């Protein structure tokens, strides 16, 4: 792995390597954010995500509002799992 980057003149400047890193880091960002979010509302059944997707409870509403009020936009209880899926898939 190290010698491959040496031979081809430093893989840090490969822009698809840089993209892959951004998605590798983003996968850690998202699972930290989403893991923490669901545990913060698990007192209200937020971990029952399929039920929250089919029958939105206050646990889903509060996790949407946390991120909206924090960073100005939010996902849904379903679509957060699409963000997760794509960030992982785009890494490789």
């Amino acid at each position: 792995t190290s010698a491959f980057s040496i031979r081809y003149g430093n893989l840090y400047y490969n822009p698809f390597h840089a993209l892959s890193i951004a998605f590798l880091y983003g996968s850690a960002v998202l699972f930290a954010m989403h893991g923490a979010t669901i545990l913060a509302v698990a007192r209200m059944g937020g971990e029952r995500e399929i039920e929250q997707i089919t029958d939105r409870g206050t646990a889903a509403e509060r996790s949407m509002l946390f991120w909206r009020w924090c960073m100005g936009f939010n996902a849904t209880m379903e679509s957060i799992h699409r963000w997760a899926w794509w960030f992982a898939v785009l890494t490789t």
């Binding site: 190290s2 850690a28 509060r62």
Partner: protein, 273 residues
Amino acid sequence: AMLSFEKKYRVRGGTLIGGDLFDFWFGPFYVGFFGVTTIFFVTLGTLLCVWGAAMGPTWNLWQINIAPPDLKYGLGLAPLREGGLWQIITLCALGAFGSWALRQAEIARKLGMGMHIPWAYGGAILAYTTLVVIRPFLLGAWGHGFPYGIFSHLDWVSNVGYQYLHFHYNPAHMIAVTFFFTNCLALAMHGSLILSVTNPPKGTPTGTSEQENVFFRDLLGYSIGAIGIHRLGLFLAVGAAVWSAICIVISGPFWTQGWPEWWNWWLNLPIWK
């Protein structure tokens, strides 16, 4: 504008500092006292970054490079054009990230949520603080921090790694990498499973926790369950950042030789010396 269900949640209270004084929204955003300090540090830091670009050789986004001072300045503030600007921007960064975590705590308290998100973010702040505060302090000069520039900081990462000849052999780095890779695998499985029960093939009924549990158990042999996978994802993602902080703080302050020769202890265990 507000979500269709949002208005009843927009109560007063839950602040840590300031009380009612800043307890209001601006568009979607909650403000609060730490919102005010967030915007202050973000603005001051960002404009000093633009000033760093202006006095540097190019406006090309990829090439802008605000570098720390020479090591000779030790723990003092250097002249601003000689790396003192990087030091002022670093204080703004620490203020902005700390204000962000405390604002997250105020938001979570207002919603009756647990404090998991602020503390999970603390893992990332710990890694940043290790890179620019703790490790440079243990080495005795702020010039050991990384430069602020989209590609010049990758040059720093390259050179720091080769300061230890073969940084892959760093044992904490191997653990940190394993957490990062395992996290990305686990995130792909969790995303896939929830989507595949909630979006089954056309004409199939919506899936259930039981189907998710059965499938997962054929993948790993055991059921993780609903709260378990979110505990795992949090453990993996935050552990990755914590082991990253460990792997860089031991490189220099505690281990100075090449990393391959650290493994000499394994070769000399008495059962096979």
